[PDB]
């Protein structure tokens, strides 16, 4: 199968910037008929993909000339000049020459921002949930940048990986930050056998982890 | 120009047969060079080409799926079909039908895509969410929406009047059920003196919960 490797996978830019996405195939995508069926597609949030470029460098009707594609053999590039909000989304390269037809993994074009440390908030299980015999502890890590982050849960100082559930928002439309929810789920009986519950966030804005904790008996 | 519109079952169980239909307009599939491909987006991510049918009934398949896929067409009903036998959870995806002409047509590429149809492989039964309050300058509150099926649920705060400072996270699969959460930040002086309520609707089970967030 023709492997399509896109670089980078995430591409943060400022409005007005130029953006460049590289696509490298595991083999020459030229077809025996002499044509090179390399295409570029854009999938905006909440939409289906749409065609941008076909046969390497041909712009599809309606696509602004600030988009351009080039390359040959196994190395291809999509360049987007004067990035604007409507350009943000996921870009895929695609080869239509060899069966199976294959796509790149997708490169997310996103916005650049000044770094911001996460605002971290931890919540004990509600008494309503405890009534049902389950116990989730929730940690929200909100409005941070860049998007990369790691969360660790400790119960009475012990690291815990099972029962953890993480979810991440897409970049925030108003302030370009990211947020994360991390939920630790136990049985009530298990929950009540321990006292200290802690979520620890590591993010490039500090060498020191951000730690939020509570004790069950409070 | 062209329009494509997929339809499917929405949900089905593993080992069953998935039948997708695509209704098209604005061109004739029987015209020389015309053809349609089916594409899917497994989970929320990536794109995978499945099969293609040409104007002359010639058909091409993703070789690793050939044994499970059948593509066909009925131009008299302006429809294209895809059948996938013996589905398993890995077949959960959004499915797209897309026009992809070849020569004589000058634009040989996937030029028109349908809006797509969501398919979920699961044996779960319809289940309303349990909604739990999340209580502790600005203060952050939240709601945990746990154990529902299927997607989607919607979440608002104070019936939508509270829209700033909200983060509602994408659902995740937890034990064959979905779980999501939402947080909101309000001025500390206003809570709990002024009520904050998360409004969770789950249309598939026709249920709504309006969970007031209370202290402790």
């Amino acid at each position: 199968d023709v492997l399509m490797t896109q670089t980078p996978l995430s591409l943060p830019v400022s409005l007005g910037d130029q953006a460049s996405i590289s696509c490298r195939s595991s083999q020459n995508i030229i077809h025996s008929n002499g044509n090179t069926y390399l295409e570029w597609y854009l999938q905006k949030p909440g939409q289906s993909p749409k065609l941008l470029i076909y046969k390497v460098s041909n712009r599809f009707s309606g696509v602004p000339d600030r988009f351009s594609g080039s390359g040959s053999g196994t190395d291809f590039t999509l360049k987007i000049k004067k990035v604007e909000a409507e350009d943000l989304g996921i870009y895929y390269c695609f080869q239509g020459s060899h069966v199976p037809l294959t796509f790149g993994a997708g490169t997310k074009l996103e916005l650049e921002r000044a770094d911001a440390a996460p605002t971290v908030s931890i919540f004990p299980p509600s008494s309503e949930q405890l009534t049902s015999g389950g116990a989730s502890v929730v940690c929200f890590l909100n409005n941070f940048y860049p998007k990369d982050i790691n969360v660790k849960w400790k119960i009475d100082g012990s690291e815990r990986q099972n029962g953890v559930l993480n979810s991440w928002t897409d970049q925030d439309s108003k302030d370009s930050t990211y947020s994360m929810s991390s939920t630790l789920t136990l049985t009530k009986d298990e929950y009540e056998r321990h006292n200290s519950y802690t979520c620890e966030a590591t993010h490039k804005t500090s060498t020191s982890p951000i730690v939020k904790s509570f004790n069950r008996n409070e | 120009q062209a329009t494509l519109k997929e339809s499917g079952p929405g949900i089905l169980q593993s080992s069953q047969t998935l039948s997708l239909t695509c209704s098209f307009s604005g061109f004739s599939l029987s015209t020389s060079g015309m053809g349609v491909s089916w594409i899917r987006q497994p989970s929320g991510k990536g794109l995978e080409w499945l099969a293609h049918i040409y104007w002359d009934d010639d058909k091409r398949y993703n070789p690793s799926l050939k044994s499970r896929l059948t593509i066909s067409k009925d131009t008299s009903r302006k429809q294209v079909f895809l059948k996938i036998t013996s589905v398993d959870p890995a077949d959960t995806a959004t499915y797209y039908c897309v026009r992809r002409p070849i020569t004589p047509v000058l634009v040989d590429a996937m030029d028109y895509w349908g809006q797509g149809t969501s398919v979920t492989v699961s044996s779960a039964k319809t289940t309303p969410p349990s909604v739990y309050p999340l209580a502790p300058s600005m203060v952050t509150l939240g709601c945990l929406v746990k154990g529902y099926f299927p997607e989607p649920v919607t979440v608002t705060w104070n019936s939508g009047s509270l829209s700033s400072g909200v983060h509602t996270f994408p659902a995740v699969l937890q034990s064959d059920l979905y779980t999501l959460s939402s947080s909101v930040t309000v001025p500390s002086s206003t809570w709990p003196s002024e009520t904050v309520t998360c409004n969770v609707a789950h249309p598939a089970s026709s249920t709504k919960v309006d969970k007031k967030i209370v202290p402790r």
Partner: peptide, 6 residues
């Protein structure tokens, strides 16, 4: 195997 383009 090549995709058919004619």
């Amino acid at each position: 195997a090549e995709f058919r383009h004619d």
